[PDB]
Design a protein around this ligand. Structure first.
Ligand SMILES: [K+]
Ligand SMILES: [K+]
Ligand SMILES: [K+]
Ligand SMILES: [K+]
Ligand SMILES: [K+]
Ligand SMILES: [K+]
Ligand SMILES: [K+]
Ligand SMILES: [K+]
Ligand SMILES: [Mg+2]
Ligand SMILES: [Mg+2]
Ligand SMILES: [Mg+2]
Ligand SMILES: [Mg+2]
Ligand SMILES: [Mg+2]
Ligand SMILES: [Mg+2]
Ligand SMILES: [Mg+2]
Ligand code: NA
Ligand code: NA
Ligand code: NA
Ligand SMILES: [Zn+2]
Lengths: 88, 71, 218, 129, 85, 211, 33, 104, 122
RNA sequence: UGCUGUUGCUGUUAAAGGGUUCGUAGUUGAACUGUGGGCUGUGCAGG
RNA sequence: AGUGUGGAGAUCGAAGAUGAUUAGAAACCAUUGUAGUCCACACUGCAAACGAUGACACCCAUGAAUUGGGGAUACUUAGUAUCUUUACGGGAAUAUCCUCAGCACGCACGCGAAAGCUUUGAGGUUACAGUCUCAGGGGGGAGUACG
RNA sequence: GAUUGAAAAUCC
RNA sequence: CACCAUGUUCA
């Protein structure tokens, strides 16, 4: 998996911190501003299903005010959002 | 800020030589004025002849007479 | 006796949350020390009073003296917490200091200096922590060198659970509140530094409150 | 004036990484800068970078993944034998487990691990981790 | 959601306002024009930011006036901007 | 977030929704521009007011609707409004969707003071104005609460995760946006159907003087 | 106020006093030269 | 010591100019720079209403249609004189920054 | 100096909330009700409470007062405000026609849904 | 004793940027001669 | 400010004079007044000569201004008016949108013992290396003594 | 001696 | 805007 390992092969890390999906930074246990946003998936019809997609954003991005831009970028990358309107 | 050149060793040597004299301990150790003014002449102990006995008043806030000898 | 006032405390009391790592992963603020008391096994948590000193405020009639107390809590295995609290009496300040130290617990990453033989002994990388003017730099050390640190940072490192470390300190280290805070912050940065071991993406997981929202509602 | 193109480029990359930008523009560019960027790319600390030709000292656009913490240049380029690798690692690197020191050896520009493998010393260019 | 800017491929709007030396690759801001003398219609090639006074070969007549940029052509003359390349 | 994994065009904006937005002037700004909100502005009118891109507004609206619908316990979503024009809108939105709400002054310490009682821990916060509801956003910045805001052209996007560009000043526009959000959330849940128009009226969402 | 603790005379007047001191000393040495 | 004001009490930045010719204070005559001096342009009615109406009733030219003359003068005060005469007062640390660009 | 202390004001407000149809505009009848509905060790406080309750009732007749919530009146106001119009305001505006500017017209032309039906340029 | 600082000091207010320009030693100094190909096997290679 | 040699000498005015005020009061305050102040030429080189912040280079968030010179009226491109107008007049100023250089303002990080600084760094530094240069090393003695 | 919390001072 | 000086030593 992911983490720091021994030569014996057992995982040594106490835990694996979450990584921000916009800037790829470890989310510390003390920042208290990092969020976890779950966007519900939608079926062919308008009704949602059980599965959801999760986004993690570091607290410093929200403090800076770039969380909205980061979420737009991440959603467009995942294909949740439409980047531009179709041709008429 | 300082010089960071690859061939600036002379400048750094001169800078350190100039600035070492501002250290009071270094200057005192490397200058003979302190040893000339030292009554012991650089010795740990010195032998003398007791000229007289006196009492020196202690400075404030203390108040006492300290027994000293002029030698 | 303890009736929780937070969703995290309710989950801990109901035993839905088992380890402090679940709280640390989602960065939830711990607002009840009973959460830490429950999650840490009995006898593992150790407390000690680092420092107690009086602070005075001048007043029209003399001056008022309060006592500021620092407490270090830790299970000697990758967990450290420091609390500082002021009280009118030494005992009250000490008790509030234990409460704050339990509230302010954080994880500590422990790694290796050379080859990875056995359990980790040192920090994975050089980390500096600054509070006020005091800055404490911790450098990884080979096995068996011990904690080369001042007496105050040494006990914080012992409670954090590191065995070998080199320590340098700058600033007015005689200011022990700032020294303790600097050591705590330096230990905190260890899980914030990114390492090629942690490059791989991890699958997202549900927040405990999200998962047990229906249980918390009832 | 500008004395070290490589130092300027590495400082620009480090500042962009600290600010969290997705990509950065480096001006001007040189062979040493390109080789340093290629070493970092090979070890995975950067990704796609593109050299734009100007009929002058060209420019570079580097895409940054959040894996790079700090990169910088050692000035002056101190000469380092095969026995000084441990001293340089313990001086400028955060750990003996990760991080690289980039040297310009007579066999090209390479990291200290590769230089030790090929048994060659050289002048220290910089570092990244 | 909007398009995120690319540093290697700037958009038309972003690159149009840039200073000529602040663009991704520098280029001239000037051009050449084919200008007909209003006296005998002889056609000469003049430069947009011409600081000299351009005389027609035949009319020996001023065809432009120097300014602080983009020299001003004489009244009654036709001009066509020649292709860059 | 009009894009679906299957590629269906169900969530795309339609002619009726565009007509509602144009009728209630949800696309009108306040002639003051903000750097964070610049991407959401299509252009500037002759009167000086900014004109908001309706496609981007709909994208952010559907994204917010999906985020709200992903919440299994609706009471975990808190809808806030302190400008006296969104109070009725958030109250009706709470009735329909099922969330909680708080109108008027936001008492400091609601999200952080765990002793004072009247202390809630929502999972998602929804605000009508980032500037007016600055206290709720600041408190959510301390307890890990994502923020969905209804933001105008001059909106400080600090600690705002999902900003919906809209006219959060007019009574009609605030009611329209909250009605659209409630309709989308209900359609995503499956309570109502998208073939038949919603029976509820936006006049109820509109704010009325009690006297 | 406008100035921290001098711990002595005003520095300008002290400098003037020292200047007069030097003037007098130089005159005395010119006398005995 | 502690920089009380970021402009150091005068409307002259660091790299703007070197010297500004001083002017005499309106009250005491102290020479102070034109940017530092507290400047107020006053338009004072030459007679207060009670006496102005009395003069207007006796004046064949002054009345409702034709107004009385005024007194226009630019007064630049030293800091001490301005504070003493209360045209300008000490302000809290927070309120020290607020400035007015017109005669309110 | 005849200000009603916070104890008097809180007691009078609680009295008004608990008994509203049982109160009046005079002081003496209100005080007579107060003696039965309140238990206190003093009579000066009872007189002050009755006076401020009379003041509160006089204010309430003219309009709602801050700090007092009457359930029946609040429910009546909510029911009155919850009255739904026959036809929606959006429907009326759409039927009458929607006017848009040049810039608003531009993106409507640029949209994938095209120009809506009942929209015209001003 | 990173209180001499090459590693590794400090100079708005604690000690400490020269009033300003020119200027020799001295120190420092922008790019550019430069992707070798092919073949067969072999890699969660990848697009 | 002072010096030298010529001028000049209105005003203000070190020194001085006189009047007050005071326990005293050739201090503040009044009324004067010499040198000065002004100029030419020659010295001096001692300012809180300050931004108490060396120079050159790079990167660096936001909104509203201002001075000068131009230009326009992960998308293949996105308007715009006003006023004067028989000779420095194919003019002048305005509006909008750019650009380059300058003085700045409230400002994102970051930094700092704090005060504060912030594309104008005091930022990009124990994760300590772009270049050059000047100063400092507890407080006095003392910027004195001597040369 | 007095004085003071001790001194000084004063008186004695 | 008359004048408006000073408080022995430790504690
Ligand atoms: K002193
Ligand atoms: K200038
Ligand atoms: K000056
Ligand atoms: K030092
Ligand atoms: K030279
Ligand atoms: K006079
Ligand atoms: K008197
Ligand atoms: K005396
Ligand atoms: Mg003072
Ligand atoms: Mg002061
Ligand atoms: Mg000082
Ligand atoms: Mg100083
Ligand atoms: Mg006399
Ligand atoms: Mg001089
Ligand atoms: Mg000294
Ligand atoms: Na001023
Ligand atoms: Na006196
Ligand atoms: Na007298
Ligand atoms: Zn004055």
């Amino acid at each position: 998996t992911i983490g720091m390992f021994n030569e014996e092969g057992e995982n040594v890390d106490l835990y694996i911190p979450r990584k921000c999906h916009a800037t790829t930074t470890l989310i510390e246990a003390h920042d208290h501003a990092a969020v976890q946003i779950s966007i519900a998936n939608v079926g062919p019809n308008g009704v949602i299903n059980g599965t959801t997609t999760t986004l993690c954003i570091a607290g410093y991005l929200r403090s800076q005010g770039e969380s909205d831009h980061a979420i737009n970028h991440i959603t467009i990358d995942r294909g949740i959002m439409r980047i531009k309107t179709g041709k008429p | 800020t300082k010089t960071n050149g690859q061939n600036a060793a002379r400048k750094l040597v001169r800078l350190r030589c100039r600035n070492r004299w501002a250290d009071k301990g270094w200057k005192r150790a490397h200058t003979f004025s302190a040893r000339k003014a030292n009554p012991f002449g650089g010795s740990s102990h010195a032998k003398g002849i007791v000229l007289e006995k006196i009492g020196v008043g202690a400075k404030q806030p203390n108040s006492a007479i300290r027994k000293c000898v002029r030698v | 006796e303890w009736v929780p006032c937070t969703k995290l405390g309710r989950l801990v009391k109901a035993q839905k949350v088992t380890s402090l790592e679940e709280i640390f992963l989602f960065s939830m603020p711990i607002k009840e020390h009973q959460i830490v008391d429950t999650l840490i096994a009995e006898g593992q948590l150790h407390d000690e009073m680092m420092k107690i000193y009086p602070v005075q405020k001048a007043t029209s009639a003399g001056q008022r003296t309060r006592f500021k107390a620092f407490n270090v809590v830790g299970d000697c295995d990758g967990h450290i917490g420091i609390g500082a609290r002021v009280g009118k009496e030494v005992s009250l300040a000490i008790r509030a200091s234990m409460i704050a130290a339990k509230l302010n617990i954080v994880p500590v990453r422990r790694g290796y200096w050379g080859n990875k033989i056995g359990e980790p002994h040192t920090i994975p990388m050089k980390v500096t922590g600054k509070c006020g003017s005091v800055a404490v730099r911790l450098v990884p050390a080979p096995r068996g060198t011990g904690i080369v640190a001042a007496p105050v940072p040494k006990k914080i490192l012992e409670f954090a659970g590191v065995e070998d470390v080199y320590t340098s300190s700058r600033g007015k280290t005689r200011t022990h509140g700032n020294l303790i805070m600097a050591t705590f912050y330096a230990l905190r940065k260890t899980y914030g530094f990114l390492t090629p071991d942690l490059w791989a993406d991890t699958e997202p997981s549900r927040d405990p409150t999200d998962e047990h929202a229906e249980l918390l509602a009832e | 004036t500008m004395m070290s193109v490589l130092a300027n480029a590495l400082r620009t990359i480090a500042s962009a990484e600290r600010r969290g930008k997705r990509q950065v523009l480096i001006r001007p560019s040189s062979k040493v800068v390109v080789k340093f960027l290629q070493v970092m790319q090979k070890h995975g600390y950067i990704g796609e970078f593109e050299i734009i030709d100007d009929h002058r000292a060209g420019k570079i656009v580097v895409n940054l993944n959040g894996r790079l913490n700090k990169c910088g240049a050692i000035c002056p380029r101190f000469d380092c034998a095969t026995t000084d690798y441990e001293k340089w690692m313990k001086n400028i690197l955060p750990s003996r487990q990760f991080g690289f020191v980039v040297l310009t050896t007579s066999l090209g520009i390479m990291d200290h691990e590769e230089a030790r493998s090929r048994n060659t010393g050289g002048k220290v260019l910089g570092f990244f981790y | 959601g909007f398009f995120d800017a690319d540093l290697s491929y700037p958009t038309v709007r972003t690159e149009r306002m840039k200073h000529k030396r602040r663009r991704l690759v520098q280029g001239p801001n000037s051009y050449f024009m084919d200008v007909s003398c209003p006296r005998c219609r002889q056609v000469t090639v003049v430069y947009s930011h011409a600081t000299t006074s351009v005389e027609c070969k035949g009319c020996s007549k001023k065809l432009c006036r120097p300014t602080g940029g983009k020299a001003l052509l004489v009244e009654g003359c036709g001009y066509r901007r020649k292709p860059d390349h | 977030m009009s894009a679906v994994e299957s590629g269906s065009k169900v969530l795309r904006m339609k002619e009726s929704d565009a007509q509602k937005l144009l009728a209630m002037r949800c696309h009108i700004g306040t002639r003051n521009q903000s750097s964070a909100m610049k991407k959401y502005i299509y252009g500037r009118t002759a009167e000086g007011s900014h004109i908001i891109d309706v496609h981007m507004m709909w994208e952010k609206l559907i994204l917010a609707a999906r985020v709200i619908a992903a919440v299994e316990n609706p009471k975990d979503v808190c809808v806030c409004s302190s400008r006296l024009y969104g109070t009725r809108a958030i109250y009706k939105f709470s009735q329909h969707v099922g969330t909680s709400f708080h109108g008027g002054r936001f008492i400091p310490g609601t999200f952080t003071n765990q002793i004072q009682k009247k202390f809630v821990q929502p999972r998602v916060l929804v605000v009508t104005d980032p500037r007016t509801d600055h206290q709720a956003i600041r408190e959510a910045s301390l307890v890990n609460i994502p923020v969905i805001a209804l933001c105008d052209t001059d909106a400080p996007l600090e600690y705002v995760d999902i900003a919906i560009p809209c006219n959060n000043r007019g009574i009609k526009s605030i009611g329209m946006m909250y009605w659209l959000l409630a309709r989308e959330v209900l359609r995503l849940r499956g309570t109502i159907v998208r073939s038949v128009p919603w029976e509820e009226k936006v006049d109820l969402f509109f704010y009325r003087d009690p006297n | 106020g406008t100035v921290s603790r001098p711990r002595g005379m005003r520095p300008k007047w002290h400098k003037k006093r020292i200047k007069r001191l030097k003037l007098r000393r130089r005159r005395m040495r010119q006398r005995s030269k | 010591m502690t920089t009380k004001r970021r402009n150091h009490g005068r409307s002259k930045p660091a790299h703007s100019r070197g010297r500004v010719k001083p002017i005499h204070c309106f009250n005491c005559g102290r020479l102070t720079p034109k940017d530092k001096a507290v400047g107020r342009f006053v338009v004072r009615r030459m007679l207060d209403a009670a006496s102005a109406r009395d003069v207007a009733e006796a004046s064949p030219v002054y009345g409702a249609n034709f107004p009385m003359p005024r007194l226009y003068m630019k007064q630049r005060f030293c800091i001490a004189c301005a504070i003493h005469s209360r045209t300008v007062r000490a302000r809290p640390v927070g309120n020290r920054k607020i400035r007015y660009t017109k005669k309110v | 100096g005849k200000i009603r202390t916070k104890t008097v004001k809180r007691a009078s407000r609680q009295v008004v909330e608990k008994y509203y149809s049982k109160l009046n505009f005079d002081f003496y009848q209100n005080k007579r009700v107060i003696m039965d509905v309140t238990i206190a060790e003093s009579k000066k406080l009872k007189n002050k409470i009755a006076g401020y309750t009379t003041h509160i009732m006089k204010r309430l007749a003219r309009g709602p007062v801050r700090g007092i919530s009457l359930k029946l009146q609040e429910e009546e106001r909510e029911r009155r405000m919850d009255h739904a119009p026959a036809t929606s305001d959006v429907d009326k505006v759409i039927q009458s026609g929607v006017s848009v500017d040049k810039k608003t017209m531009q993106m409507l032309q640029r949209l994938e849904i095209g120009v809506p039906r009942r929209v015209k340029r001003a």
